[PDB]
Automatic annotation (TrEMBL), chains A, B:
Residues of the full protein shown: 562 to 1219 of 1219
Similarity field: Belongs to the short-chain dehydrogenases/reductases (SDR) family.
Organism: Chloroflexus aurantiacus (strain ATCC 29366 / DSM 635 / J-10-fl)
Positions contributing to Mg(2+) 2 binding: 548, 600, 610
Binding site for Mg(2+) 1: 234, 237
Biological processes per GO annotation: fatty acid elongation
Binding-site list for Mg(2+) 3: 578, 583
Keyword annotations: Metal-binding, Nucleotide-binding, Oxidoreductase
Residues holding NADP(+): 18, 20-21, 23, 43-44, 47, 78-79, 105, 176, 180, 208
The name this protein goes by in its record: Short-chain dehydrogenase/reductase SDR
GO MF annotations, alphabetized: metal ion binding; nucleotide binding; oxidoreductase activity, acting on the CH-OH group of donors, NAD or NADP as acceptor
Length: 645, 645
């Protein structure tokens, strides 16, 4: 079975991160059998040593000599650490000289929470481990590849990272999905810079060869249902959220349902806990447990709701089991049957099979910027991205903007922010616009542009710096919770080179730190705002990408399209998350980036048309749905989409 | 170099159509070296014999015995002929028994004209040769594959067939592009039916390893510029098209430019012929030649314009050269530099390289419904498809509908047609709606639904049968040329099975004839209407796909999505064709098909919302642009798009 493989990559040097197990281990095994010298990097020393010994044993079985020189390991390598990535490259260049194949395989599952339960630092960590690490290794190895005239970078992404012009929602995995899409987008936009010497592609395998995941799902469901009913009750009830949460403290499902003074939202919820509940489960008679209550408390605190930290100190603890074994097993089969039902071929691919297809694929010298699917045949929802043909929203949705509180977030795009503030205030009857900027200089700029609305008290300015959540809390406390929110980036895109000339040191090329800062300002910025605004009961949120113009540098076009593709994964995922958990908020994306310079406006007239389209796109995605119109069918259409100005 | 290959497909039987040259020849060569027995089909006997002898010689070089039993040929096989496809299968099953790999490689370039110069029968022929043939061979070989428990169908499509959720415009090649997209779409929608036993994938290679093509381009440019100016002059000038064309008969560029009574459109055109012309070229001093004049005459006759067949009989013939060698060579380098500039890797892949990647890929058992790109790294325009978030068009575009002549084409979708007719007539001030149906029963149905508008003379009905062009000519002559046009299919989708049970004869499965009829009513129908309406100076055209509902059969969903994906290639291509040749008409697509049953409306309320969205989508794509608004920038946004209701 190795006969097809032996010799296929003879003389190549490959670095495989995450090379101690999984796909990465098999790719390293097969690359070495095909004749390549391989450096396997991983965290655990012991498993890496076992993988090394197994591969060297196999190489010797098929006739290779000096097998210890063909398989090296780099234990203790945490790819989230820029310092350790540098160490990894130095160790690999020392062992083998120039790397021919960089296999960016290492990946962590990430936080595995809904965005609104996802710590910001946890999100950052996934980006560092899964995405920024890929750029960092390319930035260190591509100069040697280009000097020698050939190289290959392979980013091991995922089917759930999406595809060209389509995003795949991965609920409870937004950090993972963004990092997987960014891996693909990196290949797509760097291919033209890295060519002709260097190929860069991604692979996007689907699922490859449990009661605890099911219990967590059921616990998360209970959390979401309580949070959603509380949030909803609080926007119409006269009682504070504090007083609403006290209704849960007897922790008695029947008593809440039967309480004539409880909000309908909570009474109807308790009714369905009793109806849909397993009578042998204490979750059918008790509202929550202490674990769910702490997580619910964190959601409410994080959304600026005011209530004491010990409000659940005396919560009566429900007797075990909170969910019955039958409920957990039923959900576990629901998850299993769901993954199996994805497969057209009704069979799970193995890691070995997937690595084999990848190693063959690596021999192809005519592909760059592609995403190869070594396994596939998947039935799954996808969200097409990039509609340009759109009109204004309906009068009924536009009517919901009258009297609303608008938050606008930005700094660099002053003309866009000024036109948007004036549209909401002058055309659609918004009560107030809270302008949330990064710096004092940005605040003063907006205050001068909007001086008429500032002097009338319709335009408030807040300076956020890098503390956008605290700024939003200021806005909640002083001006009220937002209806529509528009989130634009604070920073422009950098203009440094993305590759260096063949004979240079690459000293001016986009650094690893600058790429991480790109992600901070152009991806994490939007994640933080979406997380905070969803927790704070915002009605709608438009995530706006950087602007490209007819004069943007070719490098800005690349980074802009990288961000646009990567953010689509976030927008699709949180859109479905919000829909599936009965959250009201409409989250969508407005793209100011285009693929090609020739598509941009060329004269003042076309520029006016473009700014008009920008206003219409934001209104289309931010005008709230009247509650009667928010059917299952219309709900999906107005969540998690992206349109291009 | 064959060591990796030998044994890889040992014991497999492969049928390769178009197997005498090109990619197909190399795929057959490499499959045979990998151990498969191959049947190579082609038209030319001699080249097929040469390919057979070369492959058998190579097999013997690497140690195979009885090489005449491993490489068979089927000469004289025209895959556009259903009778010959049957003969081909019988000859192959006779030689080898069951086919394991069907490599649907045969393809013709097609008509290589703009849609408005493309004969309808020529389009049909491309569909038969390139697309229907693929279904026909699968329909004949899949039962034996499924009975034996394994099979593979590989459709050799093209990068220019597009991708999931994105269409690639291929101007002057609409018939080719549709057939290439249909090849991919066939794999995408049949994968779930053909699994688990049978894999079906497409490959989509890009360009693979001249003065005459350039001259034709320049001749086509001259034709387009004259046609566009004539068409435009005729819609505002008091003179008939006949009298306008007589202005060209002195065939004198300077005289036309200098004619104070000539329409501005023709005078400005002649000025640019003189300005942009090579003075050594007779095309700088003469308007046209007899070849261009005949083709222009055909465009005008085909658009229902009335003028004598011999109007150009006395056209003075311009002295050679009409275009100078310098002009032709300049255009030829423009085409060459354009193809080379597509390649990120700055190198043309070879047929051998592409076949090698394909043969490796064929060993992958975990992929179905995919499109593998064996070469890629291409910089090219793509048109994202499938935006769902859209509003109504602007008031300024909606104003252009007042007083207009609307054509509506359809039969099956009576409720859609009734609502659309009433919207245009009752809400947007259209002067008249010409309802163009397939049958008398459809006409009487629409006349009863719209009886109020029929009795007022606002709703005219015409019965088209399978002669939609003659019906449109009736409509032009009697009611005037159309402004907006909506083209819906006459027929519903069939409900027969798409695969048969493992042990049956497949007798009820969708036949080769039924698939061809599917293409006739769901693709060629739209092509014929787009061709005719563009020639007849229609202002806008919405191509509407079949409707899926929450209760459509799983088979209807498959065929619906096949059509939707395939028609996207047509819509994108003719949209760019129209834009690039300064045609006014806006051609777009409105999709009534969704991917998943769960996305459809479930109750009367959601159904009402859906019909509302249908009306808004059609208005969005059919409301004409005010001429001042039809900038380069806005022009691209409003042409060649698709949106999903």
């Amino acid at each position: 079975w190795a006969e097809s493989l032996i010799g296929l990559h003879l003389g190549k040097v490959a670095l495989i991160t995450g090379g101690s197990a999984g796909i990465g281990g098999q790719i390293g095994r097969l690359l070495a059998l095909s004749g390549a010298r391989v450096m396997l990097a991983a965290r655990d020393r012991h498993k890496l040593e076992q993988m090394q010994a197994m591969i060297q044993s196999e190489l010797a079985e098929v006739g290779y000599t000096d097998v210890e020189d063909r398989v090296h390991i780099a234990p203790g390598c945490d790819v989230s650490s820029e310092a350790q990535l540098a160490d990894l490259v130095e160790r690999t260049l020392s062992a083998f000289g120039t790397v021919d194949y960089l296999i960016n395989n290492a990946g962590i599952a990430g936080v595995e929470e809904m965005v609104i339960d996802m710590p910001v630092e946890g999100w950052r960590h996934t980006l560092f481990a899964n995405l920024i690490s890929n750029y960092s290794l390319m930035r260190k190895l591509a100069p040697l590849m280009k000097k020698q005239g050939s190289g290959y970078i392979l980013n091991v992404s995922s089917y759930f990272g999406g595809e060209k012009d389509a995003a795949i929602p991965y609920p409870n995995r937004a950090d993972y999905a963004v990092s997987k899409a960014g891996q693909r987008a990196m290949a797509e936009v760097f291919a033209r810079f890295l060519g002709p010497e260097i190929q860069i592609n991604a692979i996007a395998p689907g699922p490859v060869e449990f009661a605890r995941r099911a219990r967590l799902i059921l616990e998360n469901k209970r959390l979401n249902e309580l949070h959603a009913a509380l949030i909803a009750a609080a926007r119409t009830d006269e009682r504070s959220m504090h007083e609403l949460v006290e209704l849960l403290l007897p922790n008695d499902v029947a008593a809440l349902e039967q309480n004539p003074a409880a909000p309908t939202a909570l009474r109807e919820l308790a009714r369905r806990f009793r109806s849909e509940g397993d009578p042998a489960a204490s979750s059918s008679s008790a509202l929550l447990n202490r674990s769910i209550a702490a997580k619910l408390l964190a959601r409410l605190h994080n959304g600026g709701y005011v209530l004491p930290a010990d409000i659940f100190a005396n919560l009566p603890n429900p007797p075990d089991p909170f969910f019955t074994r039958a409920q957990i097993d039923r959900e576990a089969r629901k998850v299993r049957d769901g993954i199996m039902g994805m497969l057209y071929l009704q069979r799970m691919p193995t890691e070995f099979d997937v690595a084999m297809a990848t190693v063959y694929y690596l021999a192809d010298r005519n592909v760059s910027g592609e995403t190869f699917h070594p396994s596939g045949g998947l039935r799954y929802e996808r969200t097409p991205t990039g509609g340009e043909l759109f009109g204004l929203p309906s009068p009924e949705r536009l009517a919901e903007l009258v009297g609303s509180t608008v938050y606008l977030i930005g700094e660099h795009l002053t003309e866009h922010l000024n036109l948007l503030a004036r549209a909401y205030l002058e055309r659609y009857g918004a009560r107030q616009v809270v302008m949330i900027v990064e710096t004092e200089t940005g605040a003063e700029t907006m205050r001068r542009l909007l001086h008429d609305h500032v002097e009338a008290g319709r335009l408030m300015t807040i300076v956020a710096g890098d503390q956008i959540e605290a700024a939003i809390d200021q806005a909640i406390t002083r001006y009220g919770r937002p209806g529509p929110v528009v989130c634009t980036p604070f920073r422009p895109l950098p203009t440094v080179p993305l590759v260096g000339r063949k004979d240079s040191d690459w000293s001016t090329v986009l650094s690893e730190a600058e790429f991480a800062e790109l992600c901070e300002h152009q991806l994490t910025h939007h994640f933080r705002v979406a997380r905070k605004i969803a927790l704070s009961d915002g009605a709608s949120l438009a995530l706006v990408t950087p602007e490209t113009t007819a004069t943007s540098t070719t490098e800005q076009f690349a980074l802009a399209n990288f961000i646009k593709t990567t953010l689509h994964a976030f927008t699709a995922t949180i859109g479905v998350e919000s829909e599936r958990t009965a959250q009201r908020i409409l989250i969508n994306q407005v793209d100011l980036t285009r693929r090609a310079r020739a598509e941009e406006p060329r004269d003042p007239h076309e520029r006016q048309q473009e700014l008009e389209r920008f206003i219409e796109a934001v209104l289309l995605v931010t005008a709230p749905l009247p509650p009667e119109a928010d059917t299952r069918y219309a709900g999906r259409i107005h969540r998690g989409r992206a349109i291009t100005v």
